């Protein structure tokens, strides 16, 4: 329909009133903007002079009734925090916002038995009324027609969930910094979102009033600085910190050596001119890390300066302090996608939902007065359209994965424009994926730039146990990687200075023999370490604490490690080698920032020890190497060998799905327990690998020869244990299996004690294994191991927040928690006395 | 629970967990039925010299987690560090 948009007329004898009436308002009553001119007929050339007095105040007053839903008042202080009225996120408004922007994410659709999320796009809507309010005051004096939105950034506060449907949001916003640039006046506005009291996310915006602004008294910069860590290792760093008068410790004689100092600083700057600062006052509490990681205030930055040209504090903490999460780029920036979006013919449907009723985007006449090439499409729409493609292609159709998103509006886009975005994954930041995008119009002219910080998908680490120890494993990384080199060097040096050999030698060339020589004052130290290693064994129902290396006394000049093929295949060099290769690999991923902060980790037996030191850094690499070497030696000395070094134990890789298609793991556990009872020879299930597919049963070498014979016989006879015990006869399968265990055990008790373990139809004999570890048999071997662990793992180096819900032991098969229920579960599985002290005295450790 | 007392109890717990771990069976099925279901983990990275754990984790998902993943509509990536190193480091060939 044909509505009146302009009314040109006379207001007085000399005054003209070109009154631009826009119709798309909040209520529906069209809002009139009366811009004036002073018609002077005595100026024949230019008889029109535009009224400048009150011009910006009128323009603002119109835009108030367009955006703000309050009484018009500009005599408020910009410094003061602005608190926008709370807004409920409704399913209908999430439908209409997602329809306007063309966002096709399932998370924002009404689904069965599912919460509808709200896009972080939607946040700019709720904020808008507070954020825009920032640019209104009388001390931010500018024409709003010449408002350039430079950039807009969303940053999801760590440990928050993205916005859900029905979430009541309490919105604040404050001006970061209003600066008089040469080209105009940049206003940076940060809007916090507070749901349920707790902060969820911080929208950032950058508004650039174009023109000339000399009012530097109005200019300020209220920046909060990023936290900066300093590991104080050497006494020059202390002397430097004590020279810093600003660095005001609460206690003067606080020892700072071998600590970690965080500086939660903020920068306040007030200007004299565009280049110099009138007054700078950087202050904020100086925290120190405790061995508990709970940081304690021990002082304050209280820098107070006048005619400054910078922040010395920020400069100081920048070079001498790390930004916690360092960003590192990829080797080649991966081109993710090259997509082709499309701007709609009109922007009205987005303006209505976003409350962004700026005429210039919709009205032709305002756009003409604003010197624009037409009804320029909403930057916010271009921001939301690209982010929906970044959420589709990089986040992979997930909402929570998108955290950070900053977009700069390089050039304006006109309606009916086929844009072309280029998505590029360039870096990683503490596990997160940093993607840069550049969108171009049909002329290839840059219109959008920006970078989206995306959560890497939820990850679980599994560290392999004792598998294939191929010669020179992990050397490929050790040549290239520096993070791997550091680990390998420290380990190598520690073995040279503790056990008088080099792991690097043993991995690289795998010598058949290696002789430790205890020659000199270093030699004595090596022989003390090799002496102190002990192990406990049950002999005639008697726990004897025997000594590892019986042929190492006070007067032993050398020891010899002797293998047949290579010492790498020996457990005492297999276990550290493999654990170090895994630790070196993980340290390479962690240097390049490919480890998510919340990921789960759970290693398979030996791998577990790596995995603990990997994610949690509980033990030092000098502690890890000792505890994996000692473990390898204790395992090696557990069994009573002959002169050939051969034992009467071993393992088999049983497949319950081969013997039959009805043979479950409850059918296997019955057959193994009955075999163990009847013959009396030790046999247990030590590995539950994969359900009804992979198990490993250790124990006596004859008892695994009975198990192979029993599951060869039952496979041929085609009988099921579970069918006959339930629906045929009660307790008859017990005695009927004893006669099959007795006909296997007679033929298994006639071959000698170094009996070659023979492969059956379901089982495979795990060659090189001579000890039943993960069996009841090694309970006796735990107390010396436990004494060694408590010596090596100092309680000051353990942290709970890197274990609680993340570490999954193989003892329990339950995620690590510090509770009375889990402690009960650990005791039940392993009946120790220090777990009975903690369970009993639990009600004292609660305070 | 104070930070220092909790730290002591955690330190004593992990010590006793590592001390007895080689004296208890490796209940990995009741861990593969924790991080694949309870954590709903969609990326299983194996660090090692052979894809045993990634070849151990693709069998559990085939067996009992076809119906569970088809009812939630997630995609699970299974990777080994020895074999699938490129899709871990994000270093593909043109």
Swiss-Prot record, chain A:
The active site is at residue 605. It comes from the Eukaryota. Residues 1-423 are annotated as: Dehydratase. Residues 320-445 form the MaoC-like domain. Residues 424-642 are annotated as: Malonyl/palmitoyl transferase. There is a cross-link at residue 161 (Glycyl lysine isopeptide (Lys-Gly) (interchain with G-Cter in ubiquitin)). Fatty acid synthetase catalyzes the formation of long-chain fatty acids from acetyl-CoA, malonyl-CoA and NADPH. The beta subunit contains domains for: [acyl-carrier-protein] acetyltransferase and malonyltransferase, S-acyl fatty acid synthase thioesterase, enoyl-[acyl-carrier-protein] reductase, and 3-hydroxypalmitoyl-[acyl-carrier-protein] dehydratase. Present with 91800 molecules/cell in log phase SD medium. [Alpha(6)beta(6)] hexamers of two multifunctional subunits (alpha and beta). Belongs to the fungal fatty acid synthetase subunit beta family. This is Fatty acid synthase subunit beta. The chain holds residues 1204 to 2050 of 2051 of the full protein.
Curated annotation (Swiss-Prot), chain B:
Transmembrane segments: none annotated. The modification Phosphoserine is found at residue 50. There is a cross-link at residue 37 (Glycyl lysine isopeptide (Lys-Gly) (interchain with G-Cter in ubiquitin)). 4'-phosphopantetheine is transferred from CoA to a specific serine of the Acyl carrier domain by the C-terminal PPT domain. This modification is essential for activity because fatty acids are bound in thioester linkage to the sulfhydryl of the prosthetic group. It comes from the Eukaryota. Belongs to the thiolase-like superfamily. Fungal fatty acid synthetase subunit alpha family. Fatty acid synthetase catalyzes the formation of long-chain fatty acids from acetyl-CoA, malonyl-CoA and NADPH. The alpha subunit contains domains for: acyl carrier protein, 3-oxoacyl-[acyl-carrier-protein] reductase, and 3-oxoacyl-[acyl-carrier-protein] synthase. This subunit coordinates the binding of the six beta subunits to the enzyme complex. [Alpha(6)beta(6)] hexamers of two multifunctional subunits (alpha and beta). Present with 17000 molecules/cell in log phase SD medium. This is Fatty acid synthase subunit alpha. It comes from Saccharomyces cerevisiae (strain ATCC 204508 / S288c) (Baker's yeast). The chain holds residues 1 to 94 of 1887 of the full protein.
């Amino acid at each position: 329909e044909l509505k009146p948009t302009v009314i040109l007329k006379l207001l007085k004898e000399n005054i003209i009133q070109m009154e631009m009436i826009e119709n798309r308002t909040m209520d529906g009553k069209p809002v009139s903007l009366p811009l004036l001119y002073n018609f002077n007929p005595d100026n024949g050339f230019a008889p029109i002079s535009e009224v400048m007095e009150d011009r910006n105040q009128r323009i603002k007053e119109m835009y108030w009734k367009l955006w703000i839903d309050e009484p018009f008042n500009l005599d408020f202080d910009p410094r003061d925090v602005i608190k926008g009225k709370d807004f409920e996120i409704t399913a209908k408004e999430v439908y209409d916002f997602t329809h306007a922007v063309g966002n096709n994410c399932e998370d924002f659709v009404s689904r069965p038995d599912r919460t509808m999320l709200a896009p972080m796009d939607f946040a700019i809507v709720v904020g808008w009324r507070a954020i825009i309010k920032a640019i209104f005051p009388n001390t931010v004096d500018g024409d709003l027609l010449k408002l350039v939105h430079l950039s807009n950034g969303y940053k999801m506060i760590p440990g928050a969930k993205p916005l859900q449907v029905g979430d009541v949001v309490s919105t604040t916003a404050v001006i970061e910094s209003v600066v008089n640039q040469p080209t105009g006046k940049i206003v940076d506005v940060v809007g916090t979102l507070s749901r349920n009291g707790k902060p969820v996310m911080e929208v950032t915006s950058s508004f650039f009033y174009r023109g000339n602004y000399t009012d530097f008294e109005n200019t300020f910069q209220k920046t909060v600085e990023p936290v900066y860590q300093m590991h104080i290792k050497t006494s020059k760093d202390i002397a430097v910190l004590r020279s810093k008068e600003w660095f005001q410790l609460d206690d003067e004689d606080f020892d700072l050596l071998n600590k970690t100092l965080t500086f939660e600083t903020e920068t306040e700057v007030t200007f004299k001119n565009a280049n110099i600062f009138s007054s700078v006052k950087c202050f904020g509490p100086i925290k120190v890390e405790l061995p508990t990681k709970e940081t304690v205030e021990i002082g304050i930055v209280d820098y107070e300066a006048g005619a400054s040209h910078g922040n010395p504090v920020v400069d100081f903490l920048k070079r001498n302090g790390s930004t916690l999460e360092q960003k590192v780029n990829l080797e080649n920036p991966i081109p993710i996608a090259v997509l082709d979006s499309y701007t709609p013919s009109t922007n009205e449907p987005y303006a209505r939902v976003s409350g962004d009723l700026n005429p210039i985007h919709v009205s032709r006449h305002f756009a003409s007065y604003a010197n624009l090439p037409g009804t320029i499409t909403h930057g916010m729409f271009s921001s939301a359209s690209v982010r929906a493609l970044i959420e589709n292609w990089a986040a992979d159709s997930v909402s929570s994965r998108v955290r950070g998103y900053t977009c700069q509006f390089v050039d304006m886009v006109l309606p009916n424009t086929a844009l072309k975005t280029s998505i590029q994954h360039v870096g990683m930041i503490n596990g997160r994926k940093l993607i840069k995008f550049e969108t171009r119009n049909e002329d290839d002219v840059v219109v959008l730039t920006g970078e989206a910080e995306i959560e890497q998908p939820v990850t679980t680490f599994v560290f392999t146990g004792q598998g294939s120890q191929e010669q020179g494993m992990g050397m490929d990384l050790y040549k290239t990687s520096k993070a791997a080199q550091d680990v390998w060097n420290r380990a190598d040096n520690h073995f040279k200075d503790t056990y008088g050999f080099s792991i690097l030698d043993i991995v690289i060339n795998n010598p058949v023999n290696l002789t430790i020589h205890f020659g000199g004052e270093k030699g004595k130290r090596i022989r003390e370490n090799y002496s102190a290693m002990i192990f406990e064994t049950i002999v005639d129902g008697k726990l004897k604490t025997e000594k590892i290396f019986k042929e190492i006394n006070e007067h032993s000049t050398s020891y010899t490690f002797r293998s047949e093929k290579g010492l790498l295949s020996a457990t005492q060099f297999t276990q550290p080698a493999l654990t170090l290769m895994e630790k070196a690999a993980f340290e390479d991923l962690k240097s390049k920032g490919l480890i998510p902060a919340d990921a789960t980790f759970a290693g398979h037996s030996l791998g577990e020890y790596a995995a603990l030191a990997s994610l949690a850094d509980v033990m030092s690499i000098e502690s890890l190497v000792e505890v994996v070497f000692y473990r390898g030696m204790t395992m090696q000395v557990a069994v009573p060998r002959d002169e050939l070094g051969r034992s009467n134990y071993g393992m088999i890789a049983i497949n319950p799905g081969r013997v039959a298609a009805s043979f479950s793991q409850e059918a296997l556990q019955y057959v193994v327990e009955r075999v163990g009872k009847r013959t009396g020879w030790l046999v247990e299930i030590v590995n539950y690998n994969v359900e009804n597919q992979q198990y490993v049963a250790a124990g006596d070498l004859r008892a695994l020869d009975t198990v192979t014979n029993v599951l060869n016989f039952i496979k041929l006879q085609k009988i099921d244990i579970i069918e006959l015990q339930k629906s045929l006869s009660l307790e008859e399968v017990e005695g009927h299996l004893f006669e099959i265990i007795d006909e296997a055990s007679k033929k298994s008790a006639v071959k000698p004690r170094p009996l070659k373990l023979e492969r059956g139809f379901a089982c495979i004999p795990l060659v090189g294994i001579s000890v039943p570890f993960h069996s009841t048999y090694l309970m006796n071997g735990v107390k010396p191991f436990k004494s060694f662990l408590k010596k090596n793992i100092i309680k000051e180096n353990v942290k709970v927040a890197r274990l609680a819900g993340k570490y999954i032991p193989n003892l329990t098969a339950k995620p690590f928690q510090v509770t009375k229920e889990y402690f009960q579960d650990v005791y039940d599985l392993t009946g120790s006395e220090p777990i009975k002290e903690i369970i009993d005295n639990w009600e004292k450790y609660e305070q | 629970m104070k930070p220092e007392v909790e730290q002591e109890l955690a330190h004593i717990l992990l010590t006793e967990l590592l001390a007895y771990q080689f004296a208890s069976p490796v209940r990995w099925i009741e861990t593969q039925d924790v991080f694949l279901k309870d954590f709903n983990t969609e990326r299983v990275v194996e660090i090692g010299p052979s894809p045993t754990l990634a070849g151990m984790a693709q069998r559990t998902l085939k067996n009992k987690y076809e119906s569970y993943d088809a009812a939630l509509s997630l995609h699970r990536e299974i990777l080994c560090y020895s074999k699938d190193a490129k899709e871990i480091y994000y270093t593909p060939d043109p």
